[PDB]
Amino acid sequence: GSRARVYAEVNSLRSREYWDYEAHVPSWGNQDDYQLVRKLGRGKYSEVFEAINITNNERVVVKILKPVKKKKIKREVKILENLRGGTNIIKLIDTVKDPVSKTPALVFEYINNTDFKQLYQILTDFDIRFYMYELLKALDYCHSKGIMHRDVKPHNVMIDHQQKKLRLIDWGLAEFYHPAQEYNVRVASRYFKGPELLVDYQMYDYSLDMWSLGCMLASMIFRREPFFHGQDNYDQLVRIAKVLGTEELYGYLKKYHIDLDPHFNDILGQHSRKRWENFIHSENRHLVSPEALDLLDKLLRYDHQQRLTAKEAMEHPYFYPVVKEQSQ
Ligand SMILES: O=C(O)c1ccc2c(c1)nc(Nc1cccc(Cl)c1)c1ccncc12
Ligand SMILES: [Cl-]
Ligand SMILES: [Cl-]
C-alpha cells in the first residue's frame, strides 16, 4: 500500500501519450551519418561506441540496441524524449537505424569522463558535495518527470573532472512510476540494490534511487567502494543489516507486511545498528563531517518512505557550501 511521498500522481496528471511508451513511434534517422571510432563496451542488450558525426565532425557515442527488445527500446527512447533538456541527464542527440538491417541505435553526447575507480580516491570534501549535488539535480529532475532510473551506480554517473561536468547515463532500466504499480525487483547493480529489492517488495518508487545515491555517498566520504559489497543478493542484505541492524530490518518488514525468504534465516544473524562514525579513520576523516553523516543517515534507511527525497537531500546543509559557490 506504499506510495511515493513526492510526484506520486504526476504521470496520471499528464496525457496518456507521455507514459504509454508502447504506443510511442520514434522517428528513426540514418546511422550512416556516424563513423564508429572505438568500442567502449557492451551490456546485456547494447553495445556502445565512440563515434564521429561525419556531417558536423562532432564526437558522440552510439549505443546499438539488440533489436529483439522492442518494448524496452520504446521505453528507453520515450523516457529520454521526456527528459529532454533535463539538468545533468545525458543528452540524446538522435534515434537512428542502420538503413538496411533496421537495427536501432541511440546517439548521445560524448562525455570525457574520469573513470570512477581512479576519481573517487582523489575527491576532496568540496568535490564530493559538488558532484553529489549535481547528481541530485538529475534525480530530482527525472523523479519530477515521473521516472525512476533504477540503475544508479558509479559507472552510470559520468564525471568529467576537468570541465566539472556530470551526466546520469543508461536509462535502459528506467521506468515510469504509477501509484500502487508492482515493479520487477531485478533492477540495479547488486551493490546498489535497495533493501526493498532484496526482500522482493515490488511496490517501490523513486526512493529506490535515493538508496543507491546514499550508497555512492558512503563510498565517497568513507573511501570504501562499493560500500556494501555483497557476494550475491542474499549476502547483500546481510552486509546492509550488519550496518543498519537486524531489529531495524524486522521493523521495516513488519510495517509493509513483507515476507522474508526463509533462506535468510540461516545467514542474517543478530546485528546492532552501527554508528556511522565507526567508518571514520585517518584515511577518510577529511571527507567526513557531522553534516555528511546526518545526510547519509537519512538516505541509507530501510524504510524507503522515510528516505529523503532528491529535493530534501539537495536542501540539506551538507550542500550549503555548493549553493553558496554557485550563487557568488
Ligand atoms: O547508455 C547510455 O545512456 C550511455 C550514454 C553515454 C555514454 C555511455 C552510455 N557510455 C559511455 N562509455 C562506456 C564505457 C564503458 C562501457 C560502456 Cl558500455 C560505455 C560513454 C562514454 C562517453 N560519453 C558518453 C557515454
Ligand atoms: Cl518493472
Ligand atoms: Cl561493514
Side-chain angles (χ1 to χ4, degrees):
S2 179
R3 66 168 55 205
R5 287 192 295 108
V6 290
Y7 300 118
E9 296 287 353
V10 75
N11 290 326
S12 77
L13 296 183
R14 294 179 180 121
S15 302
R16 172 170 177 122
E17 68 179 340
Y18 181 86
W19 53 257
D20 183 8
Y21 57 84
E22 291 181 42
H24 183 54
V25 178
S27 304
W28 295 106
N30 194 332
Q31 193 183 123
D32 287 3
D33 284 343
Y34 299 90
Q35 170 65 48
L36 308 182
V37 304
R38 180 171 17 261
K39 180 176 172 170
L40 301 183
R42 178 192 74 81
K44 298 176 185 183
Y45 308 112
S46 57
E47 187 172 35
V48 178
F49 296 84
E50 183 186 341
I52 304 286
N53 182 328
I54 70 176
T55 73
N56 66 5
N57 283 0
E58 292 275 320
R59 187 176 314 274
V60 301
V61 302
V62 175
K63 180 189 188 168
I64 304 179
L65 304 167
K66 279 43 180 268
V68 70
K69 308 283 291 185
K70 169 159 235 204
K71 176 178 174 188
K72 190 181 176 308
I73 293 167
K74 287 178 193 295
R75 187 177 71 183
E76 181 172 1
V77 168
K78 185 65 180 182
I79 284 174
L80 290 162
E81 173 171 291
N82 288 346
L83 297 173
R84 187 171 179 83
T87 302
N88 296 335
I89 307 299
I90 193 72
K91 178 175 59 174
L92 177 69
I93 292 169
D94 205 5
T95 49
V96 303
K97 282 174 174 182
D98 174 320
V100 186
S101 72
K102 313 309 188 178
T103 297
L106 307 181
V107 183
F108 296 99
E109 66 185 336
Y110 173 81
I111 303 296
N112 194 342
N113 73 303
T114 305
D115 185 73
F116 70 90
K117 277 295 200 185
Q118 299 94 321
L119 178 63
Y120 285 18
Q121 300 299 319
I122 64 167
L123 294 171
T124 68
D125 179 26
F126 186 83
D127 290 336
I128 298 169
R129 298 174 194 235
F130 177 88
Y131 290 126
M132 283 283 109
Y133 195 67
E134 294 302 313
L135 175 58
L136 287 162
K137 291 174 180 177
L139 291 173
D140 184 54
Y141 190 82
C142 70
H143 297 165
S144 80
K145 293 298 196 168
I147 293 155
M148 305 175 277
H149 183 280
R150 310 198 300 179
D151 198 22
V152 172
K153 59 181 180 174
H155 181 273
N156 288 337
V157 180
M158 293 193 76
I159 295 170
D160 174 345
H161 189 55
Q162 285 70 58
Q163 294 193 46
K164 315 303 187 177
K165 289 163 66 182
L166 182 149
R167 297 291 186 273
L168 180 55
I169 66 157
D170 202 347
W171 298 81
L173 287 181
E175 250 299 1
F176 292 89
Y177 177 69
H178 297 283
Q181 182 156 322
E182 291 180 313
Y183 293 96
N184 194 331
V185 299
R186 296 185 183 182
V187 298
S189 153
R190 184 189 311 145
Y191 313 124
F192 301 90
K193 289 174 187 286
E196 58 269 50
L197 306 181
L198 299 169
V199 303
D200 311 298
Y201 185 72
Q202 296 191 262
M203 200 172 294
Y204 63 78
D205 60 67
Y206 314 112
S207 60
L208 168 60
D209 291 334
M210 298 307 299
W211 177 270
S212 308
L213 184 144
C215 291
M216 290 182 59
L217 178 64
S219 75
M220 287 181 173
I221 71 175
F222 293 135
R223 293 189 176 168
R224 183 167 87 185
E225 203 299 308
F227 188 71
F228 295 121
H229 200 134
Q231 295 303 95
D232 52 56
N233 287 345
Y234 288 109
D235 188 53
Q236 187 67 27
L237 185 64
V238 177
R239 301 312 184 105
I240 293 164
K242 286 183 175 186
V243 179
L244 276 62
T246 45
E247 292 299 299
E248 293 81 2
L249 170 61
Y250 303 140
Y252 172 57
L253 301 176
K254 176 60 171 292
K255 173 170 175 184
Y256 293 98
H257 309 298
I258 296 173
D259 293 335
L260 191 65
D261 179 332
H263 181 61
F264 280 113
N265 295 347
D266 298 305
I267 59 172
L268 271 173
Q270 294 179 340
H271 303 287
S272 68
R273 178 196 172 274
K274 306 305 188 296
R275 297 185 70 242
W276 291 109
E277 294 85 352
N278 291 4
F279 298 96
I280 302 170
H281 74 285
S282 68
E283 294 177 347
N284 63 25
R285 175 185 322 275
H286 64 292
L287 303 176
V288 183
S289 59
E291 59 271 24
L293 296 183
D294 184 69
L295 174 59
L296 184 66
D297 185 56
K298 293 166 169 174
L299 297 172
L300 292 183
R301 290 177 158 168
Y302 289 117
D303 190 339
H304 54 280
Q305 286 193 9
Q306 293 298 301
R307 300 177 195 142
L308 300 188
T309 65
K311 172 175 175 56
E312 289 163 350
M314 287 179 67
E315 298 287 340
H316 191 280
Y318 178 69
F319 298 111
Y320 178 58
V322 178
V323 174
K324 196 163 73 188
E325 187 71 32
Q326 271 177 20
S327 73
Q328 301 173 353

